[PDB]
Amino acid sequence: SHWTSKVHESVIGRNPEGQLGFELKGGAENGQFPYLGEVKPGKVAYESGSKLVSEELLLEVNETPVAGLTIRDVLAVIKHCKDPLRLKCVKQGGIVDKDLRHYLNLRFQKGSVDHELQQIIRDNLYLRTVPCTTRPHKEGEVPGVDYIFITVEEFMELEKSGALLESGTYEDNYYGTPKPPAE
């Protein structure tokens, strides 16, 4: 069954203090989906509809996709949304896990809901990251901006440490996307 089979929309308000009722954890800087902390009963101000378990992955806020962004960016999206907040979330378990590296290696059927979400998440991560490659710099490119130009040795150290969320190969070189900085 689909990665997105347990996806649902829960609707919440912020409390008087402007807080959600739960903490946000994870984020691309940690190589993760944004996901909820503990959801204690009573602490969240729901409007009618579906409710949240602890540690659900957060995919969208008010139809802005946030999976693949850093926690800072997620909080920035939330700060510019008006109540009520519509959260698209999915509980962890089975194939659904907060690890972005594992997720971005999953292969979904072209055109599926699962595939479309994975593309949206990749687009989000790409907004926040400079890719690395082992291919040499060419005329017109800016190191640090278009690519981080690194050696194979360096690229494999990053792979080994889990610092690359996505990688591939093309014409005899390695390409990948590192975790974005926290800030």
Partner: peptide, 12 residues
């Protein structure tokens, strides 16, 4: 954002 070569390297 990403170039054609990058997207061909990683897309599956």
């Amino acid at each position: 954002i990403r170039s054609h070569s990058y997207l061909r390297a990683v897309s599956e």
